[PDB]
Design a protein around this ligand. Structure first.
Ligand SMILES: *C(=O)/C=C/N[C@@H](C(=O)O)[C@](C)(Cn1ccnn1)[SH](=O)=O
Length: 357
C-alpha cells in the first residue's frame, strides 16, 4: 500500500541526490506482488526517462543467474560440484589443477584465480594458456578470493554436458521458464531503444566485451524481469520445472563460511536478522575483494529461509544490487546507471526492508 511508497521515497530520493545518480529503477517485493519505482533519465542528453522497460546492466548480479543455471545442471544430473575441473576440460593438464573442483570454481575457492580475466584473453586457446600458466596462491578449499575468472569458468564448463552454449542454455533453461522475456546476454537490435546508457564521470558508456563476460557480468535486464527473478528465488516451490526449482535452492545452499557470511552459487547469504553494519561495511571492495579464509560446510546447509540473500554488481557506469529475505517474503531490486559505492546500496536496502519487516 502507501506504507511501501513512503519508505522507498524517503530512502531512495536522498540516495539519488547524494550520489548524483542520473537514473534509477527500484522494485520492492511485498507478500509476493511487486511494486515498481523509477527516477531520473536513461539517456541524459536525449532526456529519455527511466521506465519499467528500461534495460540496466546487472553487472556481477549476472553471477546469480550463473549459479542458478549451475544448480539446475546439478539437478539434471549433468554435473556435480565435487567433480574435477579436468573432467570437463581435459586439455587442462597442468599439475595445479589436481583437486580443483567445479565447487572451487563456482565459490571462488580454487586457490587464487585472478579477479578479472586478462584483457588480451579472447580466444578459447587464449583461455587455455591463461589457465594453464596460472599459479595458485593457496590450496583448494582454503581461501576465498572473489574472481570473475573463477565462476566465469564454472558457468562455461557446467553447460558442456548439455551440448548447448552458455547463452543458449541460460535462455532455454532459466530465462524462458521464468518468463524473463526482457533479459538478454546480448541485447537485440530492436531492443536497443530501451538500453540505458551508463555514466562513468559524465561520459556515456556500455560494458565492453570480454572473455567469459556472459558468465560473470554480461547480463542486462529490466526492473520488471529482475523483480520476477526475486520472486523465483523467494519462492522456488512455485516453479513447475523440477530441475530449475531445485537449482534455485542449490544456489542458496551454504557451502562455505567466512565470519557470518555464507557463500552459495552466485548468491551470498547471512542469517536473518542481520547486523546491518556487517553487510554494509562488508560490501566495500576492500573487504569484498580481499582474500578470506573459508571453512567448509559439509553437508551444505539447505536453503535457509531466515536468511539475508544479496548480491552487488557493477560495470563501468552501472551499479545494481539485489537483496531478499525468504522467510519474510520480502525482496528489493536497485538498478542505477552509475557505479556508486556498494555500502550506499546495502544501507538503503536494509533500511527499506527492515521498515517493511
Ligand atoms: C562484478 O561486479 C564485476 C564487475 N566488473 C566490472 C567492474 O569492476 O566495474 C568490469 C566488468 C571489470 N572487468 C572485468 C573484466 N574487464 N573489466 S568493467 O569495469 O569492465
Amino acid at each position: 500500500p502507501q506504507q511501501i511508497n513512503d519508505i522507498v521515497h524517503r530512502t531512495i530520493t536522498p540516495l539519488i541526490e547524494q550520489q548524483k545518480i542520473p537514473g534509477m529503477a527500484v522494485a520492492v517485493i511485498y507478500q509476493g506482488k511487486p511494486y515498481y519505482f523509477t527516477w531520473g533519465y536513461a539517456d541524459i542528453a536525449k532526456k529519455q526517462p527511466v521506465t519499467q522497460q528500461t534495460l540496466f546492466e546487472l553487472g556481477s548480479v549476472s553471477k546469480t543467474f550463473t549459479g542458478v543455471l549451475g544448480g539446475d545442471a546439478i539437478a539434471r544430473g549433468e554435473i556435480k560440484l565435487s567433480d574435477p575441473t579436468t573432467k570437463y576440460w581435459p586439455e587442462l593438464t597442468a599439475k595445479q589443477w589436481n583437486g580443483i573442483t567445479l565447487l572451487h570454481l563456482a565459490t571462488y575457492t580454487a586457490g587464487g584465480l585472478p579477479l578479472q580475466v586478462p584483457d588480451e584473453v579472447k580466444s578459447s586457446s587464449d583461455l587455455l594458456r591463461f589457465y594453464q600458466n596460472w599459479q595458485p596462491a593457496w590450496a583448494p578449499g582454503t581461501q576465498r578470493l572473489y574472481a570473475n575468472s573463477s565462476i566465469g569458468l564454472f558457468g562455461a564448463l557446467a553447460v558442456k554436458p548439455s551440448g548447448l552454449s552458455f547463452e543458449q542454455a541460460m535462455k532455454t533453461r532459466v530465462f524462458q521458464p521464468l518468463k524473463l522475456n526482457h533479459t538478454w546476454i546480448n541485447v537485440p537490435s530492436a531492443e536497443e531503444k530501451n538500453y540505458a546508457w551508463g555514466y562513468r564521470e559524465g561520459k556515456a558508456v556500455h560494458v565492453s566485451p570480454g572473455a567469459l563476460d556472459a558468465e560473470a557480468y554480461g547480463v542486462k535486464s529490466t526492473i520488471e524481469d529482475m523483480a520476477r527473478w526475486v520472486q523465483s528465488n523467494l519462492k522456488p516451490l512455485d516453479i513447475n520445472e523440477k530441475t530449475l526449482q531445485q537449482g534455485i535452492q542449490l544456489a542458496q545452499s551454504r557451502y562455505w563460511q567466512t565470519g557470518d557470511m555464507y557463500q552459495g552459487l552466485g548468491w551470498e547469504m547471512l542469517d536473518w536478522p542481520v547486523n546491518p553494519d556487517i553487510i554494509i561495511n562488508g560490501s566495500d571492495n576492500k573487504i569484498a575483494l580481499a582474500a578470506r579464509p573459508v571453512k567448509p560446510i559439509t553437508p551444505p546447509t539447505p536453503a535457509v529461509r531466515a536468511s539475508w540473500v544479496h548480491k552487488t554488481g557493477a560495470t563501468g557506469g552501472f551499479g545494481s544490487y539485489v537483496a531478499f529475505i525468504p522467510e519474510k517474503e520480502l525482496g528489493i531490486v536497485m538498478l542505477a546507471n552509475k557505479n556508486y559505492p556498494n555500502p550506499a546500496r546495502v544501507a538503503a536496502a536494509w533500511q527499506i526492508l527492515n521498515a517493511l519487516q
